[PDB]
Structure 1
Amino acid sequence: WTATSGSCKGRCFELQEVGPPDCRCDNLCKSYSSCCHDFDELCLKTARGWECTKDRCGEVRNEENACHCSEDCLSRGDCCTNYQVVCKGESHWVDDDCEEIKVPECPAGFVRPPLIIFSVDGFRASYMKKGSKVMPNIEKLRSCGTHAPYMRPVYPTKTFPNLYTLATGLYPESHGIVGNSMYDPVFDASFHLRGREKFNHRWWGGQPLWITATKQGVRAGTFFWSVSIPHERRILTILQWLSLPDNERPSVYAFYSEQPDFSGHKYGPFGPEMTNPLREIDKTVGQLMDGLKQLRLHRCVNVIFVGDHGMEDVTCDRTEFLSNYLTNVDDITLVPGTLGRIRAKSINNSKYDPKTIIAALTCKKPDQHFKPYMKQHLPKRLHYANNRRIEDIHLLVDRRWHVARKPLDVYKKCFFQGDHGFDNKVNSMQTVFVGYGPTFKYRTKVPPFENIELYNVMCDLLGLKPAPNNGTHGSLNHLLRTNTFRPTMPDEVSRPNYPGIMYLQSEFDLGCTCDDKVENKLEELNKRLHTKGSTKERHLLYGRPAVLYRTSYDILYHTDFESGYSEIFLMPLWTSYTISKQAEVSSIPEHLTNCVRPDVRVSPGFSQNCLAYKNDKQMSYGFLFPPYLSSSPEAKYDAFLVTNMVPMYPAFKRVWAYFQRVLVKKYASERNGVNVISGPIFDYNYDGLRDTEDEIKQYVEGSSIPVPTHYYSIITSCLDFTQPADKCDGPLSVSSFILPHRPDNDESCNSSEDESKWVEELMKMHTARVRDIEHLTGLDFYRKTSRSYSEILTLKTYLHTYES
C-alpha cells in the first residue's frame, strides 16, 4: 500500500528511490503501481511533440510542452533535440564528417568521459549490413568508431539472460537469470516476462555495473525503463541528467529499445515490415547524438550500441510435440519454445524417471528437430548447468523450430513468424557491438567476441575495479585507444619434477605385457638425448603450461611428445606434440595391439595398472599421444608407456581413435602442421572448474585411477599458413574441443555408421575456447610465445564455431 497523494513537482525522474509509503517519481514507479498522482501530468509531458519547428524558435517558455525551443532551453537542459538545427542553423550530427577523437573534449566540471549504453532488443548482426541504407546514424557510429562483425550472446539467447550478462560479466548459471521464465524449486515460484515476481531482488545475483559504480563513488542513471515511457522521453531524460550539477550528475547511463525484437516476432527477421522499426531506432540514435552535440558532449561521451540477441524464422507449423514421443506426458512440466526444460509435475513422485524420459526422446524420428540432454552433458561452451533453476533434463532445439508439450498448448494460448533463444553459436542469434568515443579506437574493426567480456571494458571506461566475473580482463584491450588494465600472467603454483631412470622393470607388478624385447651406439646416446628433452622445442612450441594449484607432477620427455604427469591422478594433466604437414600415419603393429610398458622414471605406486582395466568390464583405455603418429618404429614403443594411458569407455574410444588416426593428420595437412595438447578433465559437479580429488565419483574398478568426465584438445598453428606450425613468426590460429567421456554414443543418432559420418559433427558441437579448458584444468597455456599478452588473451577466448 502506497500513499499516492504526494507530488512529483521538482522530482521527475529523480535518481534516488524514495521508499514506501512516500510516493515515487522514477522509472520503476509505474511498474510498482507507486507513482504520485501527478506523475503523468508533470513527468510525462507530450504537448507539441518532440521537434522544434521554425515557428517555435525563440518562443516564450511554456512549461506544458514536451520539450522547448525557447532561448533559455540549453541553460535549462530541456531543448528538443533538433533545437540547434532548426533554430540556430546547426547541422545534424549524422551530416557532419567523421573526425578522430584523439582526446576527450568535455565541458569544465566533467571528471571523466560519461558512458552511454544504447541497447537494442533482437538486433541481429546482419542488420548492420542488410539495413545499412535506412540507418545513417548507426552506420556512422559503426564506420567511425570501433565495431565487430558480430557479438556472441549467451545461451539461452533470450532478453533477460543476455542483458543481465551484459550488466555483470557473468554466465546465466552464475547470475541466476537462466531463462525468460524460471521455476525456482526452493522459491516454489515462477519468474515470467509479465508479472511482478520478476521485480524481486532474490532472482538477481552477482554485481551489476550500476552497483559496481555506486560502491566506488561513480553515480549511475536508471538501467530499467517502464514500457509506456516513450523513447523520445527516455532520450530527453538522459540529456537532462547530463545537465545536472557536477556533484549530482551520473557518469553511466543506459537506453533500451524493445525494437526491433517486438516486430521481428510478428514479421520474421527480414519481413518487409522490419524496415520501419530500423528507421525508427536510427532516428532515436540521431536524437541522442544531436542532443549530445547541443550540450557540447558529442566528442566527450563514450557510446556503446549493443544488442542482446538476434532473431530467426520460426512458425507454428515447426513445432515438435512431446505428446508424439511420450505416453506419460501429463506427469511432466515443460518450459517450452526455442529450448526445452523438463521436470516432474509433482515432487511427490518417486515414480518419475528421467532416464526413461530421455530414452523416449532420443533419436526416435529420423527428422527429429530437438535433442535431449542431461544438463551435465550439454556442450561445455554453453556453461549451462551449475544452477538449481536449470532443470536436469534439457532439450536443445534446432534453429527454426519450437518444442511444446501437446498441440493444444500452441492453439489454446499462427501469431508469430520470428523467435530466438537457440544455441548461442547459431548465426541468426548473433547480435551487434559498436563503440564510439574518445576511449574507443577510430575506424577500427575488431574480431567477434562474447558479450561476457564487456562488463570488464565498461568498468575500464569508467575507472572502476570490476567485481569477479567470467570475462578475461585484457582480452578486449584492442578495442581501446587508452587502457587502464595491463594484465599479467598468473604465477605458477606447482613446479614440476624432472625424474630420470629410477626403477628396474621387475619392481613393477602392473599385470601389463608388451612384445618389446627386440634389441647400435650411434642411436644409444641419441635416445638418451630424447628422454632428456632434445626434441622438446619441436613438441612444446609455446612453453610448458603452468599448473595454478598445489599438486605433485613430473615432466616426461619423449622423442615424439612431452607430458606433465600427475602423481595424484595417475595420468597426464597435459600431453604436447607437433605433427608437421609431411608426417605419416602408421598402424598399431599386430604384435603391439595390447602392449603396455612400465615407465622406469615413475614409481609402481604412482602408476596405473592393466589388471584393473581387465577387471573393469565397462572401462577400457586409450593413449594421449597417439601410437599412429609415431615418428619411427622405435619411437612408437614410447606411445605404449603406462604414463601415456588414460581410461576410456569403448564407446568413446570410437571417437578418440578416429580423431587420432584420421583428423589430426587432416588438420596438419590443411593448416600446415599443428601443435596438439590433449588431456583429461574432471568436472563431476558440473561447475566448469577443475575438480579436487575428493570430488571424483568414479574410478576404474578396484583402483585409485580416476575416470575423466571429458577429454580436451587444443590445436594450434600459424595464422599465416604459408609458415609451418613449428616455425611461425607471427600470430597463432587455434581450435579446441572438450568431448564428453560417455559410455554410449546416444548423442549421435548416426553412430551405428562409419566414424567418417558422425565423429567430426560431434566434435564440432563440443568446440571450446582455450579459456574454458583452463577453468576446467587449473592450467595456464601459451606462456612462452613471441606475442603480446593481450593478443594471447584474445586467442584464449577465441571459439571456432563452424557456422558458414
Structure 2
Amino acid sequence: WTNTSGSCKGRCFELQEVGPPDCRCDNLCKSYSSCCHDFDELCLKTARGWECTKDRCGEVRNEENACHCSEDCLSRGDCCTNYQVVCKGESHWVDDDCEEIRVPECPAGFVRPPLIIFSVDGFRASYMKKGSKVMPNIEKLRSCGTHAPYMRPVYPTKTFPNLYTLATGLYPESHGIVGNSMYDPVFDATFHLRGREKFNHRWWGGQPLWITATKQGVRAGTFFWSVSIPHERRILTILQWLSLPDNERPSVYAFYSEQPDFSGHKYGPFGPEMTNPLREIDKTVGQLMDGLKQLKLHRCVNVIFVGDHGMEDVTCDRTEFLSNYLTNVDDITLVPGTLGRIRPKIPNNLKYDPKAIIANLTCKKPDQHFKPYMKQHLPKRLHYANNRRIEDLHLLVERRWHVARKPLDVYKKPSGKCFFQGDHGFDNKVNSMQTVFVGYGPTFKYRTKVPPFENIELYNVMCDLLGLKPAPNNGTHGSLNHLLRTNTFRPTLPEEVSRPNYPGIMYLQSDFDLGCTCDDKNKLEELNKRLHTKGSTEERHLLYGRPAVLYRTSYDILYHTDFESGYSEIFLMPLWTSYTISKQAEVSSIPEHLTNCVRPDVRVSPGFSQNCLAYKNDKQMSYGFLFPPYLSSSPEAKYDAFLVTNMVPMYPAFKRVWTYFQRVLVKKYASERNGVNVISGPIFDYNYNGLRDIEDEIKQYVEGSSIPVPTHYYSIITSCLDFTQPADKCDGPLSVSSFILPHRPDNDESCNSSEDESKWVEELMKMHTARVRDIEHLTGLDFYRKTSRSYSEILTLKTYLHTYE
C-alpha cells in the first residue's frame, strides 16, 4: 500500500529512493502505478510546448507551463532549453565553432566531468551519411569529437540484448537477456518487452554501470524512463539534476529514445519518411547541448551518442514458413522473425526430436533463406550458446527475410502489403545491423576517427570516464584507450603460467611402436648436426613472439626449417603451430611415396605421442597436419611436415575444408598480402562456454586412445597493414584475419558441399571469422607478446574482426 493522496508539488522526477507508505514522483512511478495523485497533471506539464518565443520573454512566471521563460528562470532552474537564444541574444550551441576541449572547464563544485549517454534505438550507421543537412547538432558532435565509422552490436541485434550489453560489457549469454523474448525453464516463465515480468530482477545478470557506480560511491541518474515521459521532459530532467546541490548531483546520466527504430520498422531504413524522425532526434540533441551551454557545462561534460542496432529492409513478402518443411508445427513453439528459436510446445516433451527436425530444415530449397543450427554449432563469434534460456535449436535467418511457423502468422492487408518495411535481429556482422558511436568532451579526443569496434567494449570506457573499476566483463580493457585524451587504462601483459621445454634427441627411431609407416626417407637430414635447433626458425616463423601459455600444463617447443610448434604432452598435439609464407612461395604436391607417411619424432617420448593404430581403428576419424606439406620450402624440408607431432585428428568431412585452406588459400593470402604469418591449432569447447576446456570436459577421443578430438580448429593470419613491406619485415601496424572452424563429421552446414571446394569452402570460412581474442579465450594462449607496437595497439588488433561485409 502507498498513500496516493500526497503531492508531487516541488518534487517532480526527484531521485531519492522513496518507499511505500510514501507516494512516488520519479521516472518509474508510472510503471508501478504508485505515483502521487497529482503526478500526471503536474509533472507531465505539456502546456505551450518546449520552446520559448519572443513574446514569452519577460514572462509572468506561470506554473501551468511545460517550461519557463520568466526573468528569473536561470535562477528557478526551469528555463526552456532555448531561453537564452530567444530571450538574451545568445547563439545555439550548433552555431558556435568547434573548439578543442583540452581539460574540463567545470563550475566550482564539480569534481569530475559528468558523463551523459544519449542512446538512440535503431540508429543505423549509415544514417550518419544524411549529415549536417538533416542532423547538424549530431554532425558537430561527430566531426568535432571522436567517432567510429560504425559500432558492432551483439547478436541478437535487438534492443534488450544490446542495451543491457552496453550497460554491462557482457555477452547476452552471460548477462541473461538473450532476447526481447525468452523462456526460462527453471522459472517456468516468459519474459517479454511488454508487461510486468521484465521488472523482476531475477532475469538481469552481470553488473550494469549504474550499479557499478553506486557500489563505488558515484551517484547515477536513472537509466530507465517510463514510456509516458516525453523526450523533451527527459532532457529537461537531466538538466535539472545537473543543477542539484553538490551532495545530490549525479555523475552519470542517460537519455534514451525509441526513435528512429519505430519509424524504421514502419518505413524501412531508406524510406523518405525517415528524414523527419532524424531531424527530431537532432533537435533533441540540440536541446541538450543548448541546455548544457546555459548551465556553463558544455565544455565540462563528456557526451556519448550511441545506438543499440541498425535496421534492414524486411517485408512480409519475404517470409519462410516452417510448415513447408515440418509436418507438425503445432507441437513446437517458435520465437519467429529475424531469428528462430524452437522448443517443444510442452517443455521436456519426450516426443520432441530435434534431430529429425534439423534434418527436415537442412538444405531443402536452393535459395533457402535460413539455416538451422544446434546452438553449439553456431559461429563462435556470436557467443550465443551458454545460457539455459537459449534453445538448443536455432535458425539463423538471411538478411531481409523472416521465418514464421505457418502462413496464418502473417497478416497481409487488403493492400496485398503488411504494415512493416523494416526489421533487425540478424547476425551482427551484417552491414545493415551496425550502429553508431560518437564521444564528445574533455576526456575524448578532438576531431579523431577511430576504427569500428564492438559494443561490449564500451562499459570499460564509461567506467574509465567515471573513475570506476569495471566488474568482470567481456570487453578487453585497453582496446579502446585510443578514444581518450586521458583517463586511459594502463593494461598489463598477463603472466605466462607454464614455461616450455626444449627437447633435443632423447630417443632412437627403434624406441617407437606407433603403428605408423613411412615408405620414404631423407638420409641427408641425419647428417645435419644442427637439425631442429632454433637457428633462424624463430626469426622467420615466429614473428611476434611465442604465445604465452596461461594455464598449468606440460609442453615442448619444436623447431623445424619451415615451422615452429608448441607441442602439448597432455593433449598429444600442438597447442599452436607457427609459420611464415612469402609472397613468392611455391606450392608443391605430396609425393606418392609419402601419401600415408607419418614419422615418429625423436625429441618426444613414445608415451607422449599419437599412434597411428588408433586412427586405423577409428571408422569415423582421419588425420591432417597443422603445417601443410604442400608449403614445404624444399623436398628435403617436406619430411618434417610428416612428423607425428604435426598430426591432428580430423573427420574426412573437415579434411575437405582443411586441405583446401592449406593447399590453396594460404598461398592466395600470401600473394595478396605480401607474405602471411600463420598460427594454427586446435580448440576444445565441448561445454560451449567460449572458454578452453579442462581434460574432464573433453568428451570424444580417437577410438581406444587418449587422443582428444578438437571441437574446432583455428588459424590466425597476420601480415603488414602496409602490404608494400613483406610480412617478415614489417615496421608498422599489423593486419590480421582469423577463423575458428567447426570440426564436424559432415558438411551439412554447406548447402553446396557436393561441389568442388572452390565453390563453398571460402563461404564457410567467412561465416566463421573470429577475433584473436576469441581464440585466446578458447585456447588459453596469449598472442603478439613481442612486437614493436604498443600494448594498447595490440589489444585493438586482437579485438578486430575481419567481416567480409
TM-score range, shorter chain: over 0.9
Contact 2:319 2:404 in 1 (8 A): yes
Which digits, 9 at most, give the CA deviation of each residue in 1:487-543, with x for residues without a partner? 1110000000000000111111100010234xx999777561543343221000000
Which digits, 9 at most, give the CA deviation of each residue in 1:53-104, with x for residues without a partner? 1222222322221111122211222111001101111000000000100110
Name the CA shift for 1:455/1:235 in 2 (closer, same or farther; >3 Å): same
How far 1:579 moved relative to its partner? 0.2
Number of aligned pairs?
801
Name the CA shift for 1:456/1:580 in 2 (closer, same or farther; >3 Å): same
TM-score (structure 2 length as normaliser): 0.98
Contact 1:131 1:275 in 2 (8 A): no
Runs of 4+ in 1 over 4 A off after TM superposition: 520-527
Which digits, 9 at most, give the CA deviation of each residue in 1:151-198, with x for residues without a partner? 000000000100000000000000000001001111111111111111
Alpha-carbon distance in 2 for matches of 1:685, 1:59: 68
Contact 1:717 1:734 in 2 (8 A): yes
Contact 1:533 1:558 in 2 (8 A): no
Which digits, 9 at most, give the CA deviation of each residue in 1:530-565, with x for residues without a partner? 433432210000000000011000000001000000
Aligned to 1:792: 794
Alpha-carbon distance in 1 for matches of 2:15, 2:643: 68
Partner of 2:125, secondary structure, is coil
Contact 2:478 2:488 in 1 (8 A): no
Contact 2:532 2:558 in 1 (8 A): no
Contact 1:579 1:673 in 2 (8 A): yes
Contact 2:137 2:283 in 1 (8 A): yes
Which digits, 9 at most, give the CA deviation of each residue in 1:725-761, with x for residues without a partner? 0000110000000000000000000000000000000
Partner of 1:422, secondary structure, is coil
Which digits, 9 at most, give the CA deviation of each residue in 1:684-723, with x for residues without a partner? 0000000001100100000000000000000000000000
Contact 2:44 2:229 in 1 (8 A): yes
Alpha-carbon distance in 2 for matches of 1:238, 1:114: 11
Alpha-carbon distance in 1 for matches of 2:119, 2:734: 33
Alpha-carbon distance in 2 for matches of 1:348, 1:410: 28
Q: Percent identity?
A: 98
Alpha-carbon distance in 1 for matches of 2:514, 2:781: 30
Contact 1:131 1:278 in 2 (8 A): no
Alpha-carbon distance in 1 for matches of 2:132, 2:259: 17
Aligned to 2:193: 193
Residues 524-563 of structure 1 mapped to structure 2, 5 A cutoff? 528=530, 530-563=532-565
Alpha-carbon distance in 1 for matches of 2:148, 2:13: 34
How far 1:284 moved relative to its partner? 0.3
Which digits, 9 at most, give the CA deviation of each residue in 1:222-241, with x for residues without a partner? 11111111111100000000
TM-score (structure 1 length as normaliser): 0.98
Residues 516-527 of structure 1 mapped to structure 2, 5 A cutoff? 516-517=520-521
How far 1:18 moved relative to its partner? 1.7
Worse-superposed segment, 105-114 or 347-356: 347-356
How far 1:273 moved relative to its partner? 1.0
How far 1:246 moved relative to its partner? 0.7
Worse-superposed segment, 47-56 or 256-265: 47-56
Query: Over the residues paired in the alignment, what is the CA RMSD in angstroms?
Result: 1.3
Contact 1:338 1:403 in 2 (8 A): yes
Partner of 1:126, secondary structure, is helix
Alpha-carbon distance in 2 for matches of 1:136, 1:579: 49
Alpha-carbon distance in 2 for matches of 1:139, 1:684: 47
Alpha-carbon distance in 1 for matches of 2:488, 2:771: 25
Which digits, 9 at most, give the CA deviation of each residue in 1:398-447, with x for residues without a partner? 00000000111122991211000000000000000000000000000000
Residues 5-24 of structure 1 mapped to structure 2, 5 A cutoff? 5-24=5-24
Contact 2:161 2:177 in 1 (8 A): yes
Name the CA shift for 1:741/1:37 in 2 (closer, same or farther; >3 Å): same
Which digits, 9 at most, give the CA deviation of each residue in 1:278-335, with x for residues without a partner? 0000000010000000000000000000000010000011100000000021111100
Worse-superposed segment, 584-593 or 11-20: 11-20
Alpha-carbon distance in 1 for matches of 2:579, 2:153: 34
Alpha-carbon distance in 1 for matches of 2:184, 2:21: 30
Which digits, 9 at most, give the CA deviation of each residue in 1:658-703, with x for residues without a partner? 0000000000000000000000000000000000011001000000
How far 1:136 moved relative to its partner? 0.5
Alpha-carbon distance in 2 for matches of 1:167, 1:615: 52
Name the CA shift for 1:525/1:64 in 2 (closer, same or farther; >3 Å): farther
Residues 406-417 of structure 1 mapped to structure 2, 5 A cutoff? 406-411=406-411, 414-417=418-421
Aligned to 1:70: 70
How far 1:130 moved relative to its partner? 2.8
Alpha-carbon distance in 2 for matches of 1:211, 1:317: 44
Which digits, 9 at most, give the CA deviation of each residue in 1:209-232, with x for residues without a partner? 000001101101111111111111
Q: 2:747 aligns with which of 741, 745, 748?
A: 745
Alpha-carbon distance in 2 for matches of 1:503, 1:173: 48
Contact 1:116 1:303 in 2 (8 A): yes
Give ranges in structure 1 of 5+ residues lacking alignment. Answer: none
Which digits, 9 at most, give the CA deviation of each residue in 1:113-162, with x for residues without a partner? 00000000000000001354110000000000000000000000000100
Contact 1:125 1:432 in 2 (8 A): yes
Give ranges in structure 2 of 5+ residues lacking alignment. Answer: none
Partner of 2:765, secondary structure, is helix
Alpha-carbon distance in 1 for matches of 2:105, 2:490: 25
Alpha-carbon distance in 1 for matches of 2:70, 2:529: 89
Which digits, 9 at most, give the CA deviation of each residue in 1:465-484, with x for residues without a partner? 00000000000001000134
Alpha-carbon distance in 2 for matches of 1:231, 1:583: 62
Residues 37-186 of structure 1 mapped to structure 2, 5 A cutoff? 37-186=37-186
Contact 2:380 2:770 in 1 (8 A): yes
Residues 198-347 of structure 1 mapped to structure 2, 5 A cutoff? 198-347=198-347
Name the CA shift for 1:640/1:219 in 2 (closer, same or farther; >3 Å): same
Alpha-carbon distance in 2 for matches of 1:21, 1:186: 33
> 2:30 matched to 1:30?
yes
Partner of 2:342, secondary structure, is strand
Name the CA shift for 1:669/1:6 in 2 (closer, same or farther; >3 Å): same
Alpha-carbon distance in 1 for matches of 2:657, 2:525: 36
Contact 1:527 1:559 in 2 (8 A): no
Worse-superposed segment, 28-37 or 238-247: 28-37
Contact 1:463 1:484 in 2 (8 A): no
Name the CA shift for 1:52/1:532 in 2 (closer, same or farther; >3 Å): closer
Which digits, 9 at most, give the CA deviation of each residue in 1:318-368, with x for residues without a partner? 100000000021111100000000011113521211100000000001111
Worse-superposed segment, 714-723 or 525-534: 525-534
Name the CA shift for 1:121/1:226 in 2 (closer, same or farther; >3 Å): same
Alpha-carbon distance in 2 for matches of 1:490, 1:582: 37
Worse-superposed segment, 265-274 or 409-418: 409-418
Aligned to 2:670: 668
How far 1:3 moved relative to its partner? 3.3
Contact 2:342 2:391 in 1 (8 A): yes
Worse-superposed segment, 219-228 or 48-57: 48-57
Partner of 2:728, secondary structure, is coil
Alpha-carbon distance in 1 for matches of 2:256, 2:347: 39
Partner of 2:575, secondary structure, is strand
Aligned to 1:365: 365
Partner of 2:266, secondary structure, is helix
Contact 1:369 1:398 in 2 (8 A): yes
Worse-superposed segment, 670-679 or 4-13: 4-13
Worse-superposed segment, 596-605 or 32-41: 32-41
Alpha-carbon distance in 2 for matches of 1:478, 1:108: 30
Contact 2:525 2:531 in 1 (8 A): no
Contact 2:520 2:593 in 1 (8 A): no
Alpha-carbon distance in 2 for matches of 1:20, 1:331: 45
Alpha-carbon distance in 1 for matches of 2:746, 2:525: 44
Contact 2:105 2:300 in 1 (8 A): yes
Contact 1:512 1:610 in 2 (8 A): yes
